[PDB]
Amino acid sequence: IEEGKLVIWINGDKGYNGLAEVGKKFEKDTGIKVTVEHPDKLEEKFPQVAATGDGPDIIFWAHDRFGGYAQSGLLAEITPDKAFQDKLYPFTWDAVRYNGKLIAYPIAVEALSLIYNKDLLPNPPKTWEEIPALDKELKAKGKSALMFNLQEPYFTWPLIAADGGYAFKYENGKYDIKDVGVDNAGAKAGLTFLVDLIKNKHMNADTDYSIAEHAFNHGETAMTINGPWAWSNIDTSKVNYGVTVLPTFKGQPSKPFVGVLSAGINAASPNKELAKEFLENYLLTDEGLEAVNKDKPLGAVALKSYEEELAKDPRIAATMENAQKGEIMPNIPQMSAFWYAVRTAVINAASGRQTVDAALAAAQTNAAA
Amino acid sequence: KIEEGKLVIWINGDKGYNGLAEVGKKFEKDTGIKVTVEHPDKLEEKFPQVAATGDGPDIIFWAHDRFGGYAQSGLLAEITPDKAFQDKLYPFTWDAVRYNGKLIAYPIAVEALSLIYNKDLLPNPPKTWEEIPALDKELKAKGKSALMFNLQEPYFTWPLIAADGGYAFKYENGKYDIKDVGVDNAGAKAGLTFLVDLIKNKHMNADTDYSIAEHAFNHGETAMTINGPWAWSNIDTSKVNYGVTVLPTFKGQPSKPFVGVLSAGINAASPNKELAKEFLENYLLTDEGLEAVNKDKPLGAVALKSYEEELAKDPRIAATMENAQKGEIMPNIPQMSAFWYAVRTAVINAASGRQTVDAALAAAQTNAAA
Numbered sequence: 022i023e024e025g026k027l028v029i030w031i032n033g034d035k036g037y038n039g040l041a042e043v044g045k046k047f048e049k050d051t052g053i054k055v056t057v058e059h060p061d062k063l064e065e066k067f068p069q070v071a072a073t074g075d076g077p078d079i080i081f082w083a084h085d086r087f088g089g090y091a092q093s094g095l096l097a098e099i100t101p102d103k104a105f106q107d108k109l110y111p112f113t114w115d116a117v118r119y120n121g122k123l124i125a126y127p128i129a130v131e132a133l134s135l136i137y138n139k140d141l142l143p144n145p146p147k148t149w150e151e152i153p154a155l156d157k158e159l160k161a162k163g164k165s166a167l168m169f170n171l172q173e174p175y176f177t178w179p180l181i182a183a184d185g186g187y188a189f190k191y192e193n194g195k196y197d198i199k200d201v202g203v204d205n206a207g208a209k210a211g212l213t214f215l216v217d218l219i220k221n222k223h224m225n226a227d228t229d230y231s232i233a234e235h236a237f238n239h240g241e242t243a244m245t246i247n248g249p250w251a252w253s254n255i256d257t258s259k260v261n262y263g264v265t266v267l268p269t270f271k272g273q274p275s276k277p278f279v280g281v282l283s284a285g286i287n288a289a290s291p292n293k294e295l296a297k298e299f300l301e302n303y304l305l306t307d308e309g310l311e312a313v314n315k316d317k318p319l320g321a322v323a324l325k326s327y328e329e330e331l332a333k334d335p336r337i338a339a340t341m342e343n344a345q346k347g348e349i350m351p352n353i354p355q356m357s358a359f360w361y362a363v364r365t366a367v368i369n370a371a372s373g374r375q376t377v378d379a380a381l382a383a384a385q386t387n388a389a390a
Numbered sequence: 391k392i393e394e395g396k397l398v399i400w401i402n403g404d405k406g407y408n409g410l411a412e413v414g415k416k417f418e419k420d421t422g423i424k425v426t427v428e429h430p431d432k433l434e435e436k437f438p439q440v441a442a443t444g445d446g447p448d449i450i451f452w453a454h455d456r457f458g459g460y461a462q463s464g465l466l467a468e469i470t471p472d473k474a475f476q477d478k479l480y481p482f483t484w485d486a487v488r489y490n491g492k493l494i495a496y497p498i499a500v501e502a503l504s505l506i507y508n509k510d511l512l513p514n515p516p517k518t519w520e521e522i523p524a525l526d527k528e529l530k531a532k533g534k535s536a537l538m539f540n541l542q543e544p545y546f547t548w549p550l551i552a553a554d555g556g557y558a559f560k561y562e563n564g565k566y567d568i569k570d571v572g573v574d575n576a577g578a579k580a581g582l583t584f585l586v587d588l589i590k591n592k593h594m595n596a597d598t599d600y601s602i603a604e605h606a607f608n609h610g611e612t613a614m615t616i617n618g619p620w621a622w623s624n625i626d627t628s629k630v631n632y633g634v635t636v637l638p639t640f641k642g643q644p645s646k647p648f649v650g651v652l653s654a655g656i657n658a659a660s661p662n663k664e665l666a667k668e669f670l671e672n673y674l675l676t677d678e679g680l681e682a683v684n685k686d687k688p689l690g691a692v693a694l695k696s697y698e699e700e701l702a703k704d705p706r707i708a709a710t711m712e713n714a715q716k717g718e719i720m721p722n723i724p725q726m727s728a729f730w731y732a733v734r735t736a737v738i739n740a741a742s743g744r745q746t747v748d749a750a751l752a753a754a755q756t757n758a759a760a
């Protein structure tokens with residue numbers, strides 16, 4: 022890492038162009054260059070390169086990964102005063118607190134919603150169960166009912182959790198890392214339903230982020246599942262879209278894992294104080310989050326003042342409703358194992374390489390340790 | 391069923407469908423006939439299914455290799471250009487679209503993959519595949535990667551597979567021997583092993599697809615990519631300073647991209663065959679028609695003599711044909727789709743490590759020749 026400059030990592034689906042603008046603002050003021058990068062698999066890269074005193078000064082990701090990073094000593098403890106902390110919602114600080122210590126700045130709260138084409142589908146379905154029928158209706162007109170990223174368990178988890186699936190049993194403010202709920206009747210029922218959609222040709226196992234985004238944004242599919250970041254490209258595509266509550270499964274709300282986009286400071290950084298200044302004084306302000314948000318919507322920001330200003334957006338409202346129906350992700354170190362294990366189970370099951378039960382059985386064992 | 395009095399066109403989403411739409415607008419302006427260009431996923435798999443029932447597009451666009459099977463399945467109308475029109479297009483492009491004695495599509499343009507490289511990151515791209523690993527180790531220390539390209543489709547990995555002796559079907563006595571497949575021979579195994587090692591040694595990832603490779607190169611995260619003329623538009627817009635050149639050699643031998651002629655077939659079930667003929671002959675296959683499409687996404691070396699002649703000066707086009715002459719024109723026989731799926735499975739299974747190269751290619755050999 023180079024002293025006297027800021028290197029930033031943020032995921033490619035976030036507003037890195039909006040952010041780089043803030044970084045140029047930071048440069049004009051302090052003369053400090055702010056390079057914004059978006060590496061593939063950055064959540065895997067970071068720990069790798071950071072373990073050897075390398076990487077970016079600042080790293081952006083959902084809060085779930087930061088616990089593991091902190092346990093690995095890859096993060097510097099941030100030092101915001103009470104005046105600053107009070108600018109952000111206490112529940113977002115909660116998401117980035119590990120072992121009593123604040124290990125990153127919260128930026129925004131993210132949740133998946135059902136996104137639907139209002140012209141194709143004036144009244145979107147309330148349930149997963151009515152999708153096969155809808156799809157058959159749309160296939161006759163050369164469209165599909167629903168397409169969404171089947172490659173990342175983040176997009177499929179809401180369905181798996183609906184009827185009883187869960188990652189780690191959470192009771193009395195503690196997660197039981199040995200009480201995993203990926204192979205219970207609930208989790209199996211959800212994943213089986215997904216696999217049945219694929220077998221019945223209502224979806225394809227190889228659908229990923231780009232295939233789904235293209236499909237929805239060109240009006241090839243009536244629905245997709247995505248987060249606030251996705252809205253800008255839809256704006257651009259001019260599809261008349263709405264954002265609403267996710268379909269129920271067996272009468273139960275889908276339960277998305279809620280993410281808090283956070284900014285961590287590399288423990289190897291020689292630019293910690295600079296990192297602090299940039300994050301507290303430029304990014305985490307009404308105009309800073311505005312620049313990012315204009316590029317790619319952040320969702321419900323952690324900054325109270327801007328969250329209030331944007332709260333009137335029905336898309337954000339829908340995002341919070343789904344958020345209330347889901348659960349905020351744990352940030353414990355065991356999350357990476359959980360995600361990896363479930364990713365494998367879903368891909369193996371969807372592709373037909375393994376039975377649902379066998380896939381989730383293996384994921385269950387692998388998530389525990 | 392197919393609607394009378396309008397044209398519906400299927401074309402893959404990596405091509406200039408907006409450019410083609412403009413040609414359709416000109417067509418509608420002059421004839422009053424609406425032209426709708428669509429880009430379904432998996433269109434080459436959907437066509438034979440829906441055309442069989444009398445459904446689908448009036449015109450399908452795809453590389454010539456698929457059209458043989460569509461023709462054998464009775465899904466394509468024989469096209470009827472007069473001699474005067476055939477003289478407007480290169481004979482070898484008409485050859486690409488002839489099947490069992492009949493013309494079964496209009497050739498549009500010739501495609502071949504080239505090595506695309508970032509001039510600012512890489513002033514002197516590697517001449518060989520063998521020097522890429524050391525090049526990557528070097529760039530990874532600058533926060534970059536040497537090379538990223540779509541590993542999901544065998545079309546992109548084939549140049550390397552074929553370099554040392556891999557092939558689809560052996561030509562004998564004026565026709566392809568459908569039982570002589572060269573996908574599990576030594577050359578084919580050497581090529582796929584080299585790919586697999588690149589993945590094993592963290593120089594590439596098995597999961598890299600088109601979007602990831604295009605994103606990476608167009609943002610200068612990787613110094614090189616592999617792709618065809620359609621991809622150039624997006625690089626232009628990315629402002630990346632790029633060059634189009636000859637693909638790397640493998641074991642001192644040229645990579646051999648499979649050459650495809652983008653072709654336009656008329657659905658045998660279409661009640662708009664005369665409209666399709668007029669659109670294709672009088673609107674698309676003209677200087678002004680190909681130009682509209684090319685300026686959206688470059689076509690490569692177009693089949694129209696006149697337009698090809700003025701574009702030939704383009705260094706990227708010349709580079710495309712340099713790689714195309716080093717390659718082989720794809721067969722158009724019905725067995726191609728079986729070949730492609732067998733190889734697709736093979737490359738994915740081996741790259742993911744779920745199967746060994748030998749096993750993957752041994753299964754692919756049997757499957758293609760099935």
Ligand SMILES: OC[C@H]1O[C@H](O[C@H]2[C@H](O)[C@@H](O)[C@@H](O)O[C@@H]2CO)[C@H](O)[C@@H](O)[C@@H]1O
Pocket residue numbers: 032034064083084085086131173174175176248280360
């Ligand atoms: O799918 C596994 C993945 O889920 C979450 O990642 C999300 C991320 O939070 C979103 O902001 C967006 O970028 O999509 C990602 C999924 O592709 C977890 O945060 C992540 O740790 C986990 O691996």
Ligand SMILES: OC[C@H]1O[C@H](O[C@H]2[C@H](O)[C@@H](O)[C@@H](O)O[C@@H]2CO)[C@H](O)[C@@H](O)[C@@H]1O
Pocket residue numbers: 402404434452453454455456501543544545546650730
């Ligand atoms: O990968 C198998 C695939 O290869 C060829 O498809 C090419 C096509 O020719 C290009 O124009 C471009 O669209 O990329 C495709 C590969 O993704 C064959 O034409 C096709 O039949 C075959 O399935």
Ligand code: NI
Pocket residue numbers: 033058059060061605606609611
């Ligand atoms: Ni990127």
Ligand code: NI
Pocket residue numbers: 235239241403428429430431
């Ligand atoms: Ni499309």
